[PDB]
Every structure is written in C-alpha cells, then in structure tokens.
Amino acid sequence: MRECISIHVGQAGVQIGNACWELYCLEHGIQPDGQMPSDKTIGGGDDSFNTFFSETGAGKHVPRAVFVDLEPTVIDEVRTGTYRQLFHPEQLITGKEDAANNYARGHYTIGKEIIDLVLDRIRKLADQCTGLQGFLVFHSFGGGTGSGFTSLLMERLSVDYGKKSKLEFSIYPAPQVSTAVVEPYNSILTTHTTLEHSDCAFMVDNEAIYDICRRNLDIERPTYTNLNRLISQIVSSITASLRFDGALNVDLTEFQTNLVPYPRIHFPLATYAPVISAEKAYHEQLSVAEITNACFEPANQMVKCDPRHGKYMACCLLYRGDVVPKDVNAAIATIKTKRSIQFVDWCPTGFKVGINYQPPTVVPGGDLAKVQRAVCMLSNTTAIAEAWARLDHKFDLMYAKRAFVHWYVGEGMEEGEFSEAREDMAALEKDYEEVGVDSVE
Amino acid sequence: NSQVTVAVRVRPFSKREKTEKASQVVFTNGEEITVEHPDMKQVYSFIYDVSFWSFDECHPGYASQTTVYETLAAPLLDRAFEGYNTCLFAYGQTGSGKSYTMMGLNEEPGIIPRFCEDLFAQIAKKQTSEVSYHLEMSFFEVYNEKIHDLLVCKGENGQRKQPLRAREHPVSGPYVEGLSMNVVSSYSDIQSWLELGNKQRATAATGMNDKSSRSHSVFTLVMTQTKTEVVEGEEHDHRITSRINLVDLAGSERCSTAHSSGQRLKEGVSINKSLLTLGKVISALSEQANGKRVFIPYRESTLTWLLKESLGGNSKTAMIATVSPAASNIEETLSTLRYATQARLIVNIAKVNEDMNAKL
Amino acid sequence: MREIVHIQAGQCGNQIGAKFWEVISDEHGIDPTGSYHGDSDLQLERINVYYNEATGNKYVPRAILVDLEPGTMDSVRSGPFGQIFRPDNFVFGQSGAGNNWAKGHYTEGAELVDSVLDVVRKESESCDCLQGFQLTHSLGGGTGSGMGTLLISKIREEYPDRIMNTFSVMPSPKVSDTVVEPYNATLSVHQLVENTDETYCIDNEALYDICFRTLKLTTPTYGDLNHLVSATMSGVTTCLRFPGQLNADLRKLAVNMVPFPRLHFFMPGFAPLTSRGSQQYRALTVPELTQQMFDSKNMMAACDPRHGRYLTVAAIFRGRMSMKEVDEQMLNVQNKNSSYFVEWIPNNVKTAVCDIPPRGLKMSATFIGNSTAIQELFKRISEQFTAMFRRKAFLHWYTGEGMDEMEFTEAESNMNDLVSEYQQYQDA
Ligand SMILES: CC(=O)O[C@H]1C(=O)[C@@]2(C)[C@H]([C@H](OC(=O)c3ccccc3)[C@]3(O)C[C@H](OC(=O)[C@H](O)[C@@H](NC(=O)c4ccccc4)c4ccccc4)C(C)=C1C3(C)C)[C@]1(OC(C)=O)CO[C@@H]1C[C@@H]2O
Ligand SMILES: Nc1nc2c(ncn2[C@@H]2O[C@H](COP(=O)(O)OP(=O)(O)OP(=O)(O)O)[C@@H](O)[C@H]2O)c(=O)[nH]1
Ligand SMILES: Nc1nc2c(ncn2[C@@H]2O[C@H](COP(=O)(O)OP(=O)(O)O)[C@@H](O)[C@H]2O)c(=O)[nH]1
Ligand SMILES: [Mg+2]
Fold first, then answer.
1. Is B39 tagged catalytic?
2. Using CA atoms, how far apart are residues B269 and C398, in angstroms rounded to an integer?
3. CB count in 10 Å sphere of residue A417
4. Of C417, C419, C425, which to mutate for an interface test with B (greatest number of B Cβ within 10 Å)?
5. In which compartments does the protein localize (chain B)?
6. In chain C, whose CA is at the least distance from the CA of B144?
7. Angle, vertex CA B331, rays to CA B325 and CA B335, nearest 5
C-alpha cells in the first residue's frame, strides 16, 4: 500500500519532526505511548494507517521515519522527552563532532563511515513495504549537517533506488536576517549538487513567518515552536491525500509532474491561508473566495519575494473540510479575471485542485484555532530569481577576496569547485528569465 | 614593477589517445579560448593575454619550444643582468606533461636547459678580466607545511628526513637555516644535480597513476655580478646580487573522489592551501600594479614566504599552465584554467577622483 | 560525545581557574568533596564535557596546572576548592624564570614540558572523542607566556585536527605591572598567531573601569575581577554543555568569526552586569541587553571600538526568549550603525542560544567580536618595544640564555605586518 519514508536531518528537521508527529498522532487518534485507546474502543478501522505508522501484532504503532544529526543535544531531547517510547531507538547518531557550518565536513570528512548505517535502515524500511516509496527529506540550507549530508544522501538514493519521487521541505536563507555568516556558500553548493537528483524541493523561510505572526495572530513574543507547527500543518495539508479519503486526491507523483516543467526548475514556494486566533476565529465567514484570494496576497506568502514583479508558471491548491467545489471554480475564475496577476502564455490552464473531506486539527497550547476548513497553496513562480540574484551577489563579494575558505579547503575541497557552482547557478537565473519571454509567431 | 603575465598551453593527443580517438573539445578563435561540454549545453569562454597551440603541427602560429623560450624566458635572463630577482611558476595536473614543457626531451628540449645554456652563453660573452660571474645553486621542497632538502643525501637507516627552518634577515629577506649551496660551471653538472633532486622527491602511487607528485619543488639559482674596482686601488665597494627561482607545483587534488584517507589526504590539504594563498598573492600583485595601495598576505603560507624578495618589489614574474584537450578530462581541466583568470587585471572599474584646482 | 581539556599556567591562569571551577561547580551541582548535591537530572547528562567520573559518584575534573614556582600551589590547596584536583596533575618545578621569557621557553620549560605532556596524553587518551583545548595564560610576564606558548606548539604539532583556544590577559597603556611587558608579549604573539584557532584578549584596565562605573564597587579585588572572566568562559561552552533551540559549539564560533586565519584576536563581553540596588529599576528583555552589549564600556579590551569597524561578531543568549526579537534587534543594529560594520560582508552577525539559564537569573548573554580597533593596542607595543630595542635596554638578561637579536626583529615585523592588515579595512 501507499507509504512514505521520512528522513529528518539537522536541528531544523528534528525540531520540525517533533511537531509533525505531535500533529499526525493527534489526528489518527493515538497516545504518545504507542498504543491506541481510540481503536481499542472502536474495535475497528484502519485509521492508524500503514502509510506512516507501521503496526505490530501487539497493538503498538511505530512510525516510518528516521532522523539524524552529528550533535546529540537534539536526539537526547527526544529520548528524554514526551515521545521517548514511540520511535524506534535506531535514531542514528554519530555525534562525535558537528559540521562547523561547513559543507566540507558534512559531505566528506564526517560523511564517510556514517552514511552506510542510514542506507541500511532505509533498506530495512523499504523491504517492510511492497508499495509506493515517496521520500520526504526535511533539511535546511546553510548548516553543514543539513546541506552536505543531504547532498550526499540524495545522490546515493538516486543510484540505489532510481525512479522514485524524492522531495524536500527545505528552509531558505532570509535575505536580511541570518543566524550565520556562511549561508550563501553552503546554499549555492547545495543547489548545484541537488539540482539534478531531486524532483521537487519546496522552500520556506524564517522571516516571513515572523512577520505573519506579528501581523495576524497579534502575537508579540514568538519562539521556534510556533513556526514549526505551521510547517507541520502544511505537511498535513499535503499528506491528507495519501492518508485519508475524499473527492479529488493527489499522490506524490502528481506534484513532481504538475509543477516541474523543465528538469532544472523545481524550486517552488508555499502558503497557508487561514491563520487566526480564538478571537479572530469569530468575526469572519471563512468562505472559499476569501481564502483563495488570501493565498495570493503578498503578505501571506512564506518567502520575502514580491510576486507582482513575477509570474506564476504553475500552481496547485489543496483544501480541507466541508467544501463545495463550485465555490472553488468560481474562485479560480475570479482569480484569472484579475490583472495584477500575470500567468504565462504557455500555460493558460495553470491551476490544479485537490480536495479532502477531513477538517484540520489543533495542537493544544497553540495559537491556531478550531475551524471547519483550511487551504494550502504551492506555486512555481519566477519572482524567486531575485532571491537567487541576491545570493550570488552575497557570494561574488566574499569570493573576490577568497574569504571564509581556509577551513573548507582544510577539510578536503578544491577552491575551483566554487567557481563551478556560480556558473551552474547563473545559468539557472537565465532560465527564469528565458521562459518569462513569451513566444512569437 | 608588477609583471604577472600568465600563460596557458594545450598539448597534443598521445599515440594511445589517437588510437582511442579522444574527442577534441577545446577550441580557439585566436587569442580567445573556448570550451564546449560534450552535452552541448553551455560554452565556457576564457581569455588570457597569451595563448599557445600545440595540437596541430601544421596550423599557423604554432607553439614549438623555441617559441615558448623566445617569448617567456628571455626577459628573465635579460633582467637578471640588470640586477633584479625573478621567478617562474608552473601549474598542471598529471597527464598534461609539465615534464615536456619545463624539462623536455633530448630531441625537443624544454625550458630549463635552454635557460641555463643561454645563461652560460651570455656569461662566456661578457667574461672579461674586468668582470666576473659566479653562479650558485640549491634545491628544496615543501610537504605538509615543512621544509626539506633534496640535493643532499640521507642516512641509510630509514626515512631520515631533513628538518629545516625559515628565518628572516632584516635586509636580504627570508632564508633557510641549514641549506646546501653548491657551485656550477657545466650544464651536465646541473642535469646531474637535478636528477638527484627529482629522485628523492616526495611522491606516492595512486589509483590514478604511479607517477604523481605530492610536494612542491623549488630550484634556486643565485647569480653574482662583481664589477666594482676602485680606480685608485682594487676594492669591491659593492657587488650586485640577483636571484632566479623556478618552482614546480602539484595539482588541485579534489579529494571527494580520490577517497583514500590517511596521509594521502593530509598532504593534499596543505597542497591546496598553498595554491589558494599563491592565488591570493598574484591577485594582490595585479592590483599593486595599478598604483593603489594594498596589503599582501605573504606570511600566511611558506612557499610565499621564501619568495618574498623575488616575487614582490621591482621583480619580473611569470606563470604557465599545461592542460589536456581530451574531453574525458574536462573537470580537472576546467580548474586548470579557472585558477589563472588574471587576464582582466583592471576592467570595468568605477572612478571618483577630485584633486584638481592646481593654480594661483 | 565530546570533550574539553583545561591547562592553567602562571599565577593568572591558576587564580582564574580557582574561580572558573568555582562557577562551574555551582552550576552542575558540585560541592568541595567532589560529590553531587544537585536538583535536576539535566545537569548530569553532559557532565562528561569538563569532568571525569570516579568510584563513589564523585566527580573530578580534567584540570591541569603548570606553574614553575609552588607559591601558588599551597594557595590553591589551602582554599575552598583546591582539593578535588588530581594531585598527580599539580606539576611544578623550581627556580621560576623571573619574568624572563628566555628562562621559560629554553631552559626550565625544556625540563618540565615532557612531564606536562605525560599528563596531557593521559587525559586525552581517556576521552572518547576530542574537540579542542583550553588555556589561561597571561602575557607580558614569564611562565604563563613562555611555557604556555611552548605547550601550544608541541600540541599543534601533535594534535592538529582539533581546536585550540586561549583566554589571555594582555598589558595595558596607563599602568604596567611588569617593566618588560612589550618584549615578552611580542615574542609571545610570534608563536600564537601561527598556532591558534582563537584567542580572547582581556585587559585589566577595562575590568577596573567597569567595576568602578556600572557596579559602583568601592573595594574591588582581583578575585572578583576574575568573576567576569569565569562568566564569559562559562557562556562560551553553554552551547555545548546544555540544550538549545539553535545550538552551537566552539568550532562554529571559530569558522564564522575568523575570515582569514591570522585575524583571530577577539574582544569579549558579558551582560547583564548591574549593582545590588539598581536591578529593581531595570527590565529583563532582549533590547535591554543589546544596548548594553554593543556599548563601549561593557567590553574587556581597553579598546575604544568606535575608532574602527567590526569584521564579524557573535552572541550567546541564555533563557526562555523570543528569537524574533533577537534577530530583529540585530537587524536594526546592522542597519543604524553601518559605518561601524563592513560592507563586503552582508551579515556581520550570527547567533547561538541555550534554554538552561544560570543559577540566579532569568536571562543572560555573552558577546564576542573581531574588531579592527585592537589595532591601537599593538601600535603601542611595537612603539613601546622599538625605542627600548634601539638602545638594547634589558637585552642582556635575554641574550644570556642562548638567543640572538634576530629573534626579536622577526617578531616585530610579524606584529607590524599584522597591524597593517587591519588598517586595510579601516577605511571605506
Ligand atoms: C542572589 C542574587 O541573585 O544576587 C545576584 C546579583 O546581585 C548580581 C549583581 C550578580 C552578583 O555578581 C557579583 O557579585 C559580581 C560583582 C562584581 C563582578 C562580578 C560579579 C552575584 O554575586 C553573583 C550571582 O551570579 C550567579 O549566581 C551566576 O550563576 C554566576 N555565578 C556566580 O555568581 C557564582 C560564583 C561562585 C560561586 C557560586 C556562584 C554566573 C554567571 C555567569 C555564568 C555562570 C555563573 C548572583 C545571582 C548574584 C550575586 C550572588 C549577588 C551579578 O553576577 C554576574 C557575574 O552576572 C553581578 O551582575 C549580575 C547580576 C546579579 O543581579
Ligand atoms: N524553522 C526553523 N528553523 C530552524 C530551527 N532551528 C534551527 N533552524 C534553522 O537552522 C539554520 C541554521 O543551520 P542548521 O540548518 O540548523 O544547521 P544545523 O542543524 O545546526 O546542523 P550543523 O550546521 O551541522 O550544525 C537557520 O537558518 C535556522 O533558521 C527551528 O526550530 N525552526
Ligand atoms: N586579572 C588578573 N590578572 C593577574 C592576577 N595575578 C596576576 N595577574 C597578571 O599576571 C601578570 C603577571 O605575570 P605572571 O603570571 O606572574 O608571570 P609568572 O610569574 O612567570 O607566572 C600581570 O601582568 C598581571 O596583570 C589576578 O589575580 N587577576
Ligand atoms: Mg547542527
């Protein structure tokens, strides 16, 4: 049956996964202690689905996910935390030293003798299921553990497993904000190595969610939990198709097709429309027109990239809850009726739709509110060239003085490698400005 | 003055290669240089000041070793007589035949023996009773940031290295402490010494090829010029000194492919650091050329630091790089050009200067 | 699972360690017997970073001492926390160098260095995986400089893959507690810019002015001036000993902050430092710390930073916080004061955060920074140096141990050259 391996890496991926599973478990009716009071009381139902949750004869459920690092301060937080007696204690640590936020230690000096354990567990998980294997790998640019290890793993899984769907809910570098001074390098190299193997690679950012949380929810003092729950609800808004049942479902092989025209252009964005608190949950209708208009607002985006200076090459919408599809079609028509938006000439269709019957849910202690519907948007657009044109300009400066390098060459790298990626990235920029030209006859 | 003058060469196919029909890729349009990835996706373009050609023996503008010497070496031999130190570099990965360009063979001699022979010739032209010329030699290497000697033998016990130091006199710059210096008059003699040096060089076979290098190699030739004879009594109030430094360098050595940990990896790391710092030094010299004042990171490496008087100041330099045209070896080849992109010394630069109003 | 060693030379290093172990023991729940009387399990999950274990749940540290005179030894042992240390680790000799660098790099240290390394190897091999080494050594004077530099050289010939780090006091302009500071200090920098990954300059004058102005203390003492250095040291590894929403380590702070390797001389800083009455008249928020940290007066170098720009800086906050507020304040700092920052680096700040705060506060912070304004310090020493060497003032005590004028001249260049590098970026 349909299944999906999940592979978290780095402090971003694991702090995200501890929310994704907190949500997945609360949806399917599970307690953190493995067992199932819910279906114990129902005496039936597949609801603890075999898509994510493997199942033993003893009633205990074990999820199909692994996660890694080379700094055990995280995984110990799991092993002691609330969720210790759920996951498989093959939580692969080799925490003998970190990656020093360089691509070199993560992809070569401490990327050797360690990767094989991960490949062994991945095979152990695949051979348990005779079904679909769409990968989800949650990493983050900049860091070494989340750039280099990922860059090594994808190029190897493309060799062992070949033609399967591989995805990435990666994190992007904020242009102004940063928690580092090497993100540009560690990002451009990763893009070069993962332009080819991967199929799609979604992208989010840390600044836009900050600005959201100050704007709508009236939150004053965020943390690094509240954002991750929004990432987790996004992921749920996707995976509802594979788990649950409803009108128009979208498997993982569909996202890679509908949204990746050329092999090299597979770097979309993302959005969740309703973001509200217990106070603003009232005082609002929450129709479908309101939502599908909000999805294309500049502010409700999740990367600081003005789309009005760009064009939408393709788009996919995934809804939840009680929905009436003529409202959806009316919304799409109202959208194409507008003029601020500009679709290309070679895609007058553009849109895709997927519907599911389940509502969303709530993580108690959270800012979001109980509702009766919700929506997610994903777009392959062209404004994001700007968010690459800045990065190379954050690159060409430093490399002009061969700075912040001596460590990198010190862990087994050739400097000329930089001078390749700058080209393979620049070519990419040309593509996002080649297609924007409309054809001529 | 600043006289970088980087060059690039293109070898021919081998006999083995022409049997296997190595697909040509690297092309020219004269001075400009182009390359075409066999996917036919993009065309990279590289310019240099000078461009040689040794692929077709019939084409116009053919680069035979006579041309190489007569274009690059002669200014060095000339300037050394004026009393200035000079240096010559060499880049190139294994298989590009640096051995063919520098040393050469008995039927097509390279650079080294030609330079030495012309030095001998001009010596025997200027040799009078008024003027004398003394030539002294030396040879060392660099490996894991240490220094060794090669001319000198060692103890037949084991790996009896030669630990040496680098120190700084306040006048003549840096030197080595413990070094062997020798005297020369015969070209056959320096050939003997050079063989004795190249034998003990630090190397190690790999999966790529047995004959590969892991250590940079300096060949130093000190010249002397004694003329000062006081008209009222023999007296050397001064004598001019001028240095020549040839050096052979190793490759870039990407280590994510040649994954053989231990010492083979811990030596390539230092090698690449040295290459990086040398590149920074030359990129700084190209700006020193333009009258602007800047810093130079001389002390950041070793091979830069035993060259400080010969590289900078009123000193003429050079560099060349052998390559391979066979499309099977594009990756290494690309770096073998991407290191030497100093052709754009000062192009597309902004200017804001206001020091006018020089009047009454 | 990773590790840090501690070496302690001279008088300064020993009297500092005697307060650093006093602060770490107070955070991990330790008592003078070396036993445990903590409250939370969370203090013991990573106690194996600084401390070893023992038979009966006693905990004993990886501390090593050097000094070439026992005048400090009995001062430690006859104290509150001078008895947990391993008596096999209290190395010493006799006949101290007397503030002569030559007597502490050539003659006596040459007798004692192997006896030091015989213990360093024991304390290394007994670890599982190693990270880097720590040290606490003054300059200007003798023992801590000479023997410390020698230890650094021997180690980084032995163990180069790993890290090295020092917390070195420096001389000061107004008053000197030794008449031959410049000479010994220059000779120390000649062998510490090459063989180091980071070193943290501290200056006694800055601590004095701090303790006079902010805390408004009347009867200070060296033992309480050292309380700020222990604080900083503690904060630097708080990313390693504890959890954190955005963890860090030593090597991360090394890569991010050291663009070219030779410029690895820092300028530290701690916050929130306040008086015993004036804590009621303040608030604990991120900006209340951020305005205090980039101030000129909560620094420890005796170097006005606003005479120059900052190549890069860092920060380690501690407490339940809001990262948005942190990153926003750092954005505004890079905005308003661009002239004090560099243009050819786009983001001259990073961050690092831990969620397990100190014993008595709800919030704390350390600040680290690689500034150009250290330039004016070295301009002094060379100046102070060269006029003395123009006349060979105190030379013969140094030539009387098998040395040469050459060894000084080199060092001078290696400082002046370094100075020039900084000036390359002092202008726009
Ligand atoms: C009861 C109480 O909370 O009073 C505070 C206090 O008044 C202040 C002034 C403390 C006090 O600090 C000083 O007395 C002091 C004076 C001059 C120079 C250095 C220290 C305090 O003594 C210091 C002490 O700080 C700590 O406990 C930290 O854990 C500190 N460790 C120790 O002080 C300590 C040292 C030896 C043995 C046991 C504990 C520390 C700081 C950073 C990292 C690790 C540990 C505390 C809370 C206070 C007193 C006790 C008054 C302050 O301490 C520090 C370094 O942050 C001085 O400024 C803070 C702000 C506090 O308000
Ligand atoms: N959204 C989100 N991002 C996080 C979180 N924690 C860390 N990050 C991101 O992590 C990035 C820092 O580099 P990382 O990807 O964390 O690298 P790492 O996990 O430390 O792994 P190493 O670099 O090897 O140490 C920053 O861009 C942060 O935004 C989190 O909890 N939520
Ligand atoms: N901050 C601080 N510095 C000290 C202390 N004791 C000594 N020093 C410094 O240490 C230097 C003396 O050098 P010293 O270590 O005695 O040389 P040694 O005798 O060879 O060990 C002086 O410059 C002081 O500034 C102290 O208790 N606190
Ligand atoms: Mg990490």
1. no
2. 39
3. 20
4. C417
5. Nucleus; Cytoplasm; Cytoplasm, Cytoskeleton, Spindle; Midbody
6. C157
7. 90
Q: B168: distance to nearest CA of chain C, Å?
A: 6
**What whole-number distance in Å separates Cα of residue B141 and Cα of residue B126?**
33
B97 is annotated as an active-site residue: yes
Please list every residue in chain A followed by a chain break, i.e. its C lies more than 2.5 Å from the next written N.
none
C-alpha distance from residue B350 to each of A375, B346, B347, C58, C346 (Å): 51, 10, 9, 68, 21
Residues contacting C113, CB < 8 A, separation 6+ = C147, C150, C151, C154
Tokens of residue B242, six digits: 């001028």
Annotated domain spans of chain A: 1-268, 269-383, 384-441
| 3-class DSSP assignment, residue B319 | strand
Is the Cβ–Cβ distance between A383 and A310 less than 8 Å? yes
Q: Is C99 left (phi over 0), alpha (psi -120 to 50) or beta?
A: left
Please identify, in words, the CATH class of the domain defined by B7-339. alpha beta
Burial of A441: CB neighbours in 10 Å, binned 0-12, 13-18, 19+: exposed
Which of C49, C255, C350 should be substituted to probe chain A, the one whose Cβ sees the most A Cβ atoms within 10 Å?
Answer: C255
C-alpha to C-alpha distance for C15 and C224, rounded to whole angstroms? 11
* Active-site residue, B95 included: yes
Report the alpha-carbon distance of residue B120 to residue B127 in Å, rounded: 10
- Dist. CA B3–CA A379, nearest whole Å: 54
Q: Which residues contact C129 (CB under 8 A, 6 or more apart)?
A: A96, A97, C1, C2, C3
The method recorded for this entry reads: cryo-EM
Instruction: Report which protein residue has its CA nearest ligand 3's atom 27.
Output: C222
Nearest CA in chain B to C406: B169
- Measuring CA to CA, which residue among A288, A295, A290, A240 is closest to residue A273? A295
Angle between helices C286-293 and C323-336 (to 10 degrees): 30
CA distance A412 to chain B (A): 6
| Residues of chain A positioned with their CB less than 8 A from the CB of C1 | 72, 95-96
Q: How many residues does chain C have?
A: 428
Assigned token pair, C29: 């729940």
Question: Does C195 contact chain B (CB < 8 Å)?
Answer: no
Resolution in A: 3.6
Q: Residue C320: CA atoms inside 13 Å, Cβ hemisphere, count?
A: 3
Ligand 2 site: residues with CB under 6 angstroms? A 10-12, 15, 71, 98-99, 101, 106, 140, 142-146, 171, 179, 206, 224, 227-228; C 245-246
CB C207 within 8 Å of CB C338? no
What is the C-alpha to C-alpha distance for residues A138 and A20, in angstroms, rounded to an integer?
11
Closest CA to A34 of A82, A93, A68, A92: A82
Helix (H, G, I), strand (E, B) or coil at C75: helix
Q: Which residue has the tokens 């704390």?
A: C364
Query: CA–CA separation, B190 vs A11, rounded Å?
Result: 61
- Residues flagged as binding site of B: 92-99
CB contact under 8 A, B294 and C424: yes
